[PDB]
Motif scaffolding. Structure first.
Motif, short mmCIF file in Angstrom:
data_model
loop_
_atom_site.label_atom_id
_atom_site.label_comp_id
_atom_site.label_asym_id
_atom_site.label_seq_id
_atom_site.Cartn_x
_atom_site.Cartn_y
_atom_site.Cartn_z
N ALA A 55 14.08 46.15 -9.84
CA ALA A 55 14.73 44.86 -10.21
C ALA A 55 16.02 44.59 -9.25
CB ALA A 55 15.12 45.15 -11.68
N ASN A 56 16.55 43.52 -8.99
CA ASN A 56 17.30 43.04 -8.17
C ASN A 56 19.07 43.44 -9.06
OD1 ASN A 56 19.08 42.06 -6.33
ND2 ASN A 56 18.11 40.30 -6.16
N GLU A 57 18.82 43.62 -10.28
CA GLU A 57 19.93 43.85 -11.16
C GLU A 57 20.72 45.03 -10.62
OE1 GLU A 57 18.18 44.08 -15.01
OE2 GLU A 57 17.89 41.89 -15.04
N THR A 58 22.00 45.11 -10.78
CA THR A 58 22.93 46.14 -10.53
C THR A 58 23.01 47.19 -11.76
OG1 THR A 58 24.91 45.19 -11.09
CG2 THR A 58 24.28 45.09 -8.82
N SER A 59 23.65 48.29 -11.85
CA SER A 59 23.67 49.15 -13.11
C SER A 59 25.08 49.51 -13.11
CB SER A 59 22.76 50.32 -12.91
OG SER A 59 23.23 51.05 -11.77
N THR A 60 25.47 50.48 -13.61
CA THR A 60 26.82 51.18 -14.02
C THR A 60 26.67 52.58 -14.23
OG1 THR A 60 26.92 50.48 -16.34
CG2 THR A 60 27.70 48.92 -14.83
N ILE A 61 27.83 53.57 -14.17
CA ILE A 61 27.68 54.76 -14.44
C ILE A 61 29.10 54.98 -15.22
CG2 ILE A 61 27.94 56.85 -13.25
CD1 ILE A 61 26.92 55.92 -10.72
N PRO A 62 28.68 55.24 -16.42
CA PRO A 62 29.70 55.65 -17.28
C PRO A 62 30.85 56.94 -16.93
CG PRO A 62 27.86 56.60 -18.29
CD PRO A 62 27.25 55.63 -17.08
N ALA A 63 32.04 56.80 -17.26
CA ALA A 63 32.89 57.79 -16.94
C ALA A 63 32.77 58.79 -18.17
CB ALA A 63 34.40 57.23 -16.98
N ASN A 64 32.82 59.93 -17.81
CA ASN A 64 33.21 60.67 -16.53
C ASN A 64 31.86 61.17 -16.00
OD1 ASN A 64 36.17 61.27 -18.23
ND2 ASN A 64 35.97 59.99 -16.51
N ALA A 65 30.71 60.59 -16.07
CA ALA A 65 29.57 60.94 -15.35
C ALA A 65 30.04 61.16 -13.83
CB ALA A 65 28.43 60.46 -15.55
N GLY A 66 29.69 62.27 -13.12
CA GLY A 66 30.14 62.40 -11.75
C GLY A 66 31.69 62.81 -12.09
N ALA A 67 32.70 62.29 -11.12
CA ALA A 67 32.37 61.28 -9.93
C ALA A 67 31.63 59.92 -10.29
CB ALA A 67 31.44 62.20 -8.90
N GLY A 68 32.28 59.09 -10.49
CA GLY A 68 33.86 58.80 -10.31
C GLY A 68 34.35 59.18 -11.85
N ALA A 69 35.69 59.20 -11.89
CA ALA A 69 36.29 59.46 -12.96
C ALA A 69 36.44 58.20 -13.95
CB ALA A 69 37.96 59.63 -12.90
N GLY A 70 36.23 57.00 -13.34
CA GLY A 70 36.08 55.82 -14.17
C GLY A 70 34.52 55.32 -13.97
N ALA A 71 34.50 53.98 -14.32
CA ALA A 71 33.20 53.12 -14.14
C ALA A 71 32.67 52.76 -12.69
CB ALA A 71 33.32 52.04 -15.07
N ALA A 72 31.50 53.07 -12.64
CA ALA A 72 31.06 52.47 -11.24
C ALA A 72 29.81 51.71 -11.13
CB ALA A 72 31.12 53.78 -10.18
N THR A 73 29.77 51.05 -10.18
CA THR A 73 28.30 49.86 -10.18
C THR A 73 27.63 50.32 -9.08
OG1 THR A 73 29.51 48.34 -9.28
CG2 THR A 73 29.60 48.38 -11.45
N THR A 74 26.21 50.30 -9.08
CA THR A 74 25.33 50.51 -7.71
C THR A 74 24.48 49.16 -7.45
OG1 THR A 74 23.74 51.49 -9.25
CG2 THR A 74 25.31 52.97 -8.18
N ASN A 75 24.41 48.98 -6.28
CA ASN A 75 23.35 47.95 -5.41
C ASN A 75 22.06 48.55 -5.48
OD1 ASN A 75 25.41 46.01 -5.73
ND2 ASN A 75 25.96 46.37 -3.61
N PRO A 76 21.27 47.90 -5.85
CA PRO A 76 19.91 48.43 -5.80
C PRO A 76 19.22 48.58 -4.40
CG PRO A 76 19.55 46.31 -6.63
CD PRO A 76 21.24 46.69 -6.55
N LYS A 77 18.43 49.36 -4.03
CA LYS A 77 18.06 49.37 -2.33
C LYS A 77 16.68 49.46 -2.38
CE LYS A 77 18.44 49.91 1.96
NZ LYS A 77 18.45 48.81 2.70
N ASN A 78 16.14 49.04 -1.18
CA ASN A 78 14.64 48.89 -0.87
C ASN A 78 14.01 50.30 -0.79
OD1 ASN A 78 14.27 45.76 -0.61
ND2 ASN A 78 16.10 46.54 0.84
#
Lengths: 350, 50, 100
Positions: free
Chosen positions: A286-309
């Motif tokens: 999917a072209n859709e982006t996602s999010t990474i909840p805190a505090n998974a990883g890294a980072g300390a806050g929320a983060a979003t990822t662009n999908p890649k081919n």
């Protein structure tokens, strides 16, 4: 029995420092400084190196392209010696080498992915002052001889004095293996059902389903460890795992020691693997982006990822000096996925 | 060299197998009298004595 | 091209050794001989030397005939000497592998 499965082509590139300059035979400066150097009619350069376990050694090198050819000679197994499958290419700058592997060849560990120690030697490690003339010619090393690889990483982007010379390594293709015995799988969080992920302020350990999810966002799934399965759902879930967290799309690399960290990105969260009632497997991007909840990883806050081919490619498992027999009929039903998958509404099937 | 167990040849026993390049199971590692050898034409080499 | 010279007093050499050579039987039934470019090692304390040592592989040139004793009655067996007669050419170091 099992199957090699690559999600993207292996890739790495030599890394010039920004302060460096390419060797310049045309100019007449009495002594070029810390220029990179790849041999000359006057000067041979050694290049001791060991990628994928097949040692490469030579000391008659005169130009980088000879290094390219001589490296290319090892790409395929011969009557005796093993082949690496890795394909060197001249770097566009003329600075160094672009290593690239389609890892669609062979069927053993050596033919897959890129691995590369850079053994002490490496006069082709291209970092030596040398000098021109007086009179006829003559380019010469500045005080015999040229420096060796040392603990460099002459071109690898790093340094590591401890032990053997430093080696970059970059995983893109994992392997999978069946077994008759029951096999439980380490659960982890999904950004869909099965909620959820409680952060545990700073500290990782949390619940195990969330603990595995924590480690996953480092390089823990990038490991070259074998992955067992039995029931089909094991297989789909596991393919989804690796597809999401298991590949170096950037062409970055582990570099020597195993010290996993968050990346931007290995992540490709939007990927999905499903089983249609027709019985076909399905993979979607999917072209859709996602999010990474805190505090998974890294980072300390929320983060979003662009999908890649992605670019799937598939062969068959076979151990070195082993007795396991290739199972072609199974490798075919998975052989259906071999083409490229651009981001979009298309969904491949087995 | 496959299986790395040491089973010595010429025993005329403990015959040992392997899966082939296809899939059929077949005999491997068996010495032969050499007095039984035939060429491609199937004629006997008929080797004898000394 | 050294030689035993008079008395039989054997010693370590550099070299008679050519360790990388291999002889195999392919499932086709053909014999095979190979000469890898790879070097080898001699563990201590075999020989001479007291320590480890390494050998460079050296080129070979096979050539083959048939046995026959002087003033004897043994008959030449040509059909066998042929299947081995296949090896008569030179073998330079390399990936090529001769077969019977």
């Amino acid at each position: 029995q099992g199957i090699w499965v690559s999600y993207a082509d292996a890739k790495f590139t030599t890394d010039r420092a920004n302060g460096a300059n390419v060797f310049d035979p045309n100019l007449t400066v009495a002594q070029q400084n810390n220029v990179i150097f790849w041999g000359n009619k006057d000067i041979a350069v050694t290049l001791d190196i060991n990628l994928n376990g097949v040692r490469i050694q030579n000391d008659n090198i005169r130009s980088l392209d000879e290094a390219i050819a001589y490296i290319n000679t090892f790409t395929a197994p011969t009557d005796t010696r093993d082949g690496t499958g890795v394909k060197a290419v001249k770097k566009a700058d003329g600075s160094g080498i672009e290593f690239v592997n389609n890892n669609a060849d062979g069927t053993t560990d050596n033919m897959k992915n890129i691995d590369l120690t850079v053994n002490v030697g490496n006069s082709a490690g291209e970092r030596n002052t040398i000098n021109y003339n007086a009179n006829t010619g003559v380019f010469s090393p500045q005080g015999g001889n040229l420096t060796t690889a040392q603990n460099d990483t002459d071109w690898i982007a790093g340094a590591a004095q401890a032990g053997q010379p430093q080696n970059v390594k970059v995983v893109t293709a994992h392997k999978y293996i069946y077994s008759s015995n029951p096999v439980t799988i380490p659960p982890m969080i999904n950004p869909d059902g099965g909620p959820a992920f409680q952060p545990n302020n700073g500290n990782r350990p949390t619940d195990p389903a969330s603990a595995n999810y924590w480690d996953a966002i480092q390089g823990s799934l990038k490991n070259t460890t074998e992955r067992t399965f039995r029931t089909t759902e094991d297989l789909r879930e596991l393919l989804q795992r690796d597809a999401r967290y298991g590949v170096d799309y950037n062409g970055s690399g582990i570099i020597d020691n195993a010290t996993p960290t968050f990346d931007a990105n290995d992540i490709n969260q939007a990927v999905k693997v499903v089983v249609t009632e027709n019985g076909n497997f399905a993979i979607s991007n999917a072209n859709e982006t996602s999010t990474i909840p805190a505090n998974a990883g890294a980072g300390a806050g929320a983060a979003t990822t662009n999908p890649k081919n992605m670019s799937f490619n598939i062969t068959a498992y076979s151990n070195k000096q082993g007795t396991v027999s290739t199972n072609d009929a199974f490798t075919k039903i998975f052989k259906a996925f071999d083409g490229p998958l651009v981001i979009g509404n298309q969904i491949k099937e087995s | 060299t496959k299986t790395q167990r040491a089973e010595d040849e010429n025993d005329t026993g403990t015959t040992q197998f392997y899966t082939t390049s296809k899939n059929s199971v077949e005999v491997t590692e068996k010495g032969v009298d050499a007095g039984a050898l035939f060429n491609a034409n199937g004629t006997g080499l008929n080797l004898r004595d000394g």
